[PDB]
C-alpha cells in the first residue's frame, strides 16, 4: 500500500506532467482537480494524515458535501508533481455541509489547495448537473496558442468557437457545444469562479482572455484531450493568421454536414456565422 | 512463446505512434495507423489470440485483401497511450476468405474496435498494393501541424501544393516525385473520403485532407513515417518563410529537373510545369 | 553517507540546467547558474569533498560573501551535459574567511573552473542579499529565445518592456511587479556589464541583455527558474501576437491595477503610465 | 575489454545524432556525422572489429587521411534509430596506408555502408585539418530548420547572411568570427558540391546549402554540434523577428567590432561593410 | 515518463512489499530478480545512468546475453523498496557475451545487485530451458514456516514434497513437480548457485535448510503465490505437528485422484510414499 | 450513472476478499466468494454491462436460480488483487430463464470466468435458499488456517468437531447452533463435492472440507464473513490449547445448554450429547 | 524550510517505532528508541525549534556527549502514536557543552519528557561509540515476543543462547558474529541495569533482558531495527521448532565456521564450543 501508486495519483502526475511538456504550465501556472469517490480513497485511510487540517470554503457548496478530490497545490509547479506528488498534490474531502474541507493527504509542508479552487468547485457543481454526474475533471492551464488568439480574435463565444472548429476538422465533434469566453477578470476571486461556472453550464471549454483555458471532462485523459484539441486548432490558426489569413476553410454547410455524420448538435450561434 | 507485444510489428506500432505524439501530430484521438502483415508474422503467436475473436462486417468487399492480417490503431484511442497499453489501443485483425469482414485476433481489448478511417485505409492499401506491386504495406494518417496550416493559404491543388513542398526542402522531390494529392474538404470517417483517398493513392503516396491532415503510404513503418515527416518538415519551413513575407529566391524548375535526373526519378509533370 | 550527487542541491542544479536545455535556452556553453548554500547543506558530505581543494583568487575581494559556499556551473560546460556528469560540469566552491577567493571543494573536475562569470554572479548575489534581507540565493542567466527576439522589436526601456510582458500573461504582474530592467547592449564578460546588471538587480529580480539573454534572481532554484519561465512564456505569447498583426485587445491599464491590488502587490509605477 | 558501444565516441555519436533528431533537424535519412579518431581510441576494442573487415576503394585518394580511423553514420540510416541500434547505423572505418580506401572495422551491419558523402566529408576534413593545424575532427550535416528557412528570405551571400546571424545572438560573432559560407543551390551527392563545400571550409567552419541545410566542422562532437546549434539558435531568433516586422534595433557595427576586440577574434571584414 | 511507475518497478515494489508484510524478509533477508525484454525498458533509455557501471559476472552466462533484469540490491531491506525504489532496486543488462552486466538504472549510492545473483542467474538459465522461456521470475525469501519445517522433516525432496501436498489440497496442483531440497550450504557462493540451478531443472520450488526457499514462475504474482502456497501448507503443518501430528490426511490414492482431475502429473517419488 | 465498481455489492466483494487475504485465509488463488443479488441492484448499471455478454453452460439445471444474478470471484484469481482491479477478478453473472447457464454481464475481463467451485456454490445457495426461505444470499469459501489444521487432529465428525468449536469460544453456540458439517476429503472443483456440500448446507450454515477449507452461508457479506471468522477464531484458540497439551477445563454440557436457552436457540443435539 | 517532521530522522523514528508496533514488540508504553544526530542534521531547522528550549539536568554528567543532539522517544508515550503526532511523542534534545544536561529543542510537547531511560541509553551510546569508533548511533529497546519467550526456555547464557540464535537462521552468524549478551533478570529502570547493559554493549551489539526484552545498537535506524528483527526472526523459527519437538538436524558447528569464513567475519568463540 502506497497511495502514490493509486490510479488517481498516477493520473494526476501524468496530466500535470504532460501539460508541463506541452509547455502550457510555466512556474505555478495551471491547476487541476479531480472528483473521487469514497471507494477510491477507502483502501488508503491509513495513508492519510491523522490530524486533518480544515479550511473554510469561500462559500457554501452543499452539493459537493462529503466529496473527496485530489488537487494540485497553490504555488506548485506541474513540472514537480511527478517527482514529489505528496508535496504538490493533496486529497481533500468537503465536510457534510459544503462549508469546507479537510486535507486528508498530501499538500505537505503546510501547503494548501490551488487558488482557483473556488472556480473549480463551482464549475464542478455545474458540470455535475449538466452531465448527470459524468464529468469529474476540471483543468486549467495556460495553453499558449489559445492565449495568443485571445489578443487577435473578437472575444466572442460564437466567433471564437467558429474559428476553432475551422482550425481542425476534429473540433466540431470534440466540442460541439463550443467554447465560452469571459471578459478579462481579476483571477482567483469568487467573482471569476462564478462566471466560469456560469459558462460551464453551456460549454465544457472556457477561455480566460490573456490568461488561459478551463476544461471539464469525465476522465483525466478526456479532459486533457479536450484542451489539447482546442489548443492544436489554435496553434494551426496562429500559423495561418501569421501567413496572412485563410484563403479557404471548412464551410458552414460542411460543418453542419460534419455535425450530422457524428450525431452531434453544433452550437447554433457558431453555425450562424 | 514470447508474448506478442514484444513482436517487431507491435513495437513498431508503439514507436511510430509514440514518435507521432511527440512530434505533436496527434492530439486527442487524432491520427491512425495500419500495417499489413503476413501469416508468418503472427503465426508464432496463435497462443495470444483471443479465444472468441470478434468479427466485424466490412464497409465493402475487398477481395484483394482476403485472408490478410493487419495490426491497427483503435478508434477513439490516443497515440499517446499506445506505449503504456498496446493491447488496449492496438489490434491485430484478419480479413476473411472473401474480403467481407475481419476478426479481431488480438488486442483492441475492452470492446474497442479499429479506427474510424479504416475504410479509407483498406481502400488505399489495395491501390498502393496494385500500384507498388505489393511493396507498400503501411498507411498512415496524422494531423501534421504545418501541412494542415498550409492548406488554409495555398491553392488546394496537387500541382501547386506539390511544387511548393518540393521547393521547401531539396530532398522532397526525390522522396516523393509522384507529388502529393489534394482532396477537397470532405466529411471524414466515411467511405466517400475513403474512396477519394484511394483514388489518389493510385497516383501519389502522399495525400492531404484540407483542414484535417495527411495520408501516407510506404513499404515500412519508418519509410512511411519519414515520408510524412519530410513533407511536414518542408511545410514547417514554408510556414516560417511565408510568415517572413514569402520567398526571395528558391529552387528553380531547371534545378528541380536537374535534381530529378541525378536521382533517376521522374517528377510529376504538372508540378514541374509551374 | 548518501553520495553528494543525490543531495537536494546537486539534483536541483541538474534539473534546472537540464530543463533550461530542453527549453532551448542554452545552446553550446550558453548560460550559467549559481546557488548560495549554507554549511548545514554541504557539511554532511565532507566525505565527498576534494582532499586537497584547489583554491582560486577572486580578482576583486568579496568579503561580504566570506565563508559562503555556492554550487556553480562550470566554464565552457554545456548545460546539456550537467546530467551526464554532474561533477564534471558543476562544482561546489567556498569563499574564504576574508573573501579573497574560494576553494573548489567538490566537482569541477579535469581542471575545470566556475563560469568565467562568477564575478558578475557574486556581484549580483550581494546586491540581492541586500535587497531581500538574505532571501535571494540564485542568479540565473540563460538565452530565453523569445525574450531575446522581443529585444529586437520592442523599445529597450524597462517601463515599456515591463508593461508588454505584464500584458502578455495575467500572472506576470504578480510574479514580477517590480518589472524587468533592460540594459543597453554591452560586451559580455566585462566588469562593465557585471556592474550594470547588479545596478539593475537592486531594483528588479529580472534583467534583460538585448540581443543576448536574461538574468534572474530568486530564493530557490524553482523560484528563479519559474521567474524566467514566466517572463519567457509571456514573451512567447507576445511573439505570436505580434506575428499576427498585434493586439486587438489586452489587459487594461486599469485592470493591471485591479490585479496588483487583488494580490496586494505594488506594480512598478512607470509601467503603468507611459 | 568493454564493448565498443559504451565507448566515449560511440556514446558521443548516439547523443549527437539523437539530439539532432529531437531538434527536428534530421527527418528520414537527412543528415550525417563523421568523427576522426586516434588509433589509441579504437585500440582497446581491437577484439570488437570484424575478422575480415570489408575494404572499400575511395573515389579519389587522400594521403592526408591515410591510416586515420573515423566513426561515421550510415547510408540511408535514420538518425532517430542510432539510439536503439548503434552497430546498425554507425560504423568505424579505417583509411589504409595511402588513403586509397578504408575498412569497415566495426558496425555498419546488415551490409550497410557509410554515408554516400564520406568523400564530401573526407575532403572537408582535409581542408579543416590544414586550416586548424589538426584541431578540427568533425564534419556535421543536418537540416537546421530555421537556417534553412532563412535561405529563402535572405540574400544567399556569405557577408550579409553572416551579418544577420551575428546580430541574431551576441555570442555568434565570437563563436564563428570567420562567418558562414553560402553556396548557390546545388545537386546534393555530386562531387561539385563536395568540392564547393570543401573550398568554403578553408575560410569558414560553417557552410550553408540553400534550401537544404548546413555543414559544420569542429574539434569535438559537442563543439561542432554547439557550432551549428548556435547558428541555428540565431536563425530561430531572426525568423521570429522578421515575422514580427523586422528589427527595430540590433547590435551595431561598432559593437560587433567591440565584441570581437574583447574576445581577441578577428571578424570577417566583408560582413562588416555592406 | 518516470520509470518508477513502469509495470515492472511497481511489480517489484508490490512483491517485496508483500513479502515484508508476510514477515518473510527481515533485515536484508530475501532477494528478487525479474527478466525483462529490451521492449520493456526501451521507453526509458533516458531514465538510465549515462555512465553505466560494469560488473564482471562470477562466471560466463552467454544464454542471458544482452538480457536486462530488474533486481533487488545487496544489503537492501524489502521493507524499504516501496519508499525508495531506485535505492533498493536496479535494472541491469548482461553484456553481449554473458561475462558481466551494466547497471543501467537504480542501485544508487554505489549499491550493487543481491549477493545471490549467481544463484539467480543460474536458476534463470535452467528455468528458461525447462519452461521454453515461460518463467521470468526467481524469488528468494525466508518463509518462516518452510524454514521451521526443515529442522523437523527429513530433508528429502520426496518426503518434504509429500508433507507439503498433504498440508493443503491446493499444493499438488500448484507444484506437482514437487519441491527440491539441498543439503545446507554456505550461501552467496557459486557452489550453491549451481546446486539450486541443478534443482530448478526438475522443480520450480527449492528449499535451503535452515535458510529459506527459492521459487521460479512466469510472473511476479505467479511466483509469489507459488511460495505463499508452499508456505501456507508449512504453516498448517507446523500447527498440526505442534498438536501432536496427523490423525488423518489426504491419501496417496486421493492425491493421484487430485492429479488426474487437474490434468497434472505428480512427482512420482512423492506419490510412492 | 455511477460506475458499477462503486456499487455497494462490488465494494462489498472487495472488502470481504481483501479482509480475507489479510487474515491470511487466501494464499495464491485459494478461496472464492459468491453473492446473490436482485434485478434492482444491477438494474441501474445496464450501461456498464458488456455488449456481447459471454454465456456459459451450467454444470446442471438449477431452475430454482433462474434469472438470478450473482457477483462472483474469478477462477485462478487472487483475493489479494480484487481491490486493485475489481473487473478483472470479479464478475456479475445472470442465470438464464431455465437455470441452464449464465451470462457474464460485467467483469471477469480478459477471458476470465467464474470460480471453479461454482457448482458447489450454486448448489449450496439453492439449499440455503430453501432452508432459510430466501434469507441467505452468500456462499463463502476460504482456507481458514486453523480450521484446516484442526481437521488433521480432530475426528472428522460433525458432532465432535461442532462440540470442540463451541467449547473454543462461548459465542460459537449462539452464532452457529446448527453446528458445522464435515465432509470426507474429496477431489475439489467437481460436482461431487458440490452436491455433498449442498447436502450439508441443508443442515448447517458452516461446512468443512478436510485438509482444504471451510464453506459458509449467510444473509449478508459481513454476517457470512463473521460466521467463518468466529469458527476460525475458535479454531485458533483450540490450536493453541491443544499445543499446550489440551483442555484442563472448558464449557460444560449443562453450560452449553444453559447458553442455548438464554439465547433462544436450539443446539444441534448430537453435539450436546457428547 | 521544509518542516522538520519531514526530515529524514523524524521520518526514520516514525518508521522504526511504527514497524515495531505493527510487529507486536511494543504494547502500551513498552520500548524506546534514541538516535544520535549531528548539527548538520538539525541545523537546517533552527526555525522549527522551541524559542525557549526547556532544559533538564542529567542526573549524572555525560560530558563525552557534550553538545551532542539526539532525537528520542518520550516517557509514557505509545510507539503506536508516534506517527499520529511526532512532536508529541518524539523530541530532539541537545546535551550542553559540559554534559551537565540537555535542552529540548523540538517536540516532546505538553510537558512530556524523554524516556525515563535516557540515562541507560546515553550510558550505552558511550560504550558503543568507544567500541565502534563513533559508528553506532542507535540504541533500541523493544519487547521482541519470541526472544522474550525463549528466555523462559533456554539457558540464559550468552554462549548457548547465541548458538541457538545462529542455528535458527543462517544469516544470524554474519549479522551478529559477536553473539548476544544475556543478563540475569533485573529491576527495570535502575542504574544497576543501565550499567550491566552497557557492560555487555562493549562486547555485543545485541543484549537480552530475560522475561522482558532486547537491547540493540547499530549505525543507522534500519541497521539497528534489522539487527533486532533478525534475532527475533530466528527466535520465531526456534519457537516453532521447539513446539514441534526440537531439532532433527541443524547448522553444524563446522558449517557455522565455514559460514564465518565465507563472510570473513569472526564468530564468538564460546558459542562454538559448549
Ligand atoms: Zn492561471
Ligand atoms: Zn483525422
Ligand atoms: Zn550568455
Ligand atoms: Zn542533406
Ligand atoms: Zn537468504
Ligand atoms: Zn479451495
Ligand atoms: Zn521495556
Curated annotation (Swiss-Prot), chains B, C, D, F, G:
It comes from Escherichia coli (strain K12). Homotetramer. Belongs to the aldolase class II family. RhaD subfamily. This is Rhamnulose-1-phosphate aldolase. Signal peptide: none annotated. The lineage of its organism: Bacteria, Pseudomonadati, Pseudomonadota, Gammaproteobacteria, Enterobacterales. Zn(2+) binds at residues 141, 143, 212. InterPro entries: Aldolase_class_II_sugar_metab, Aldolase_II/adducin_N, Aldolase_II/adducin_N_sf, Rhamnulose-1-P_Aldolase. It holds the Pfam family Aldolase_II. The active site is at 117. HAMAP family: RhaD.
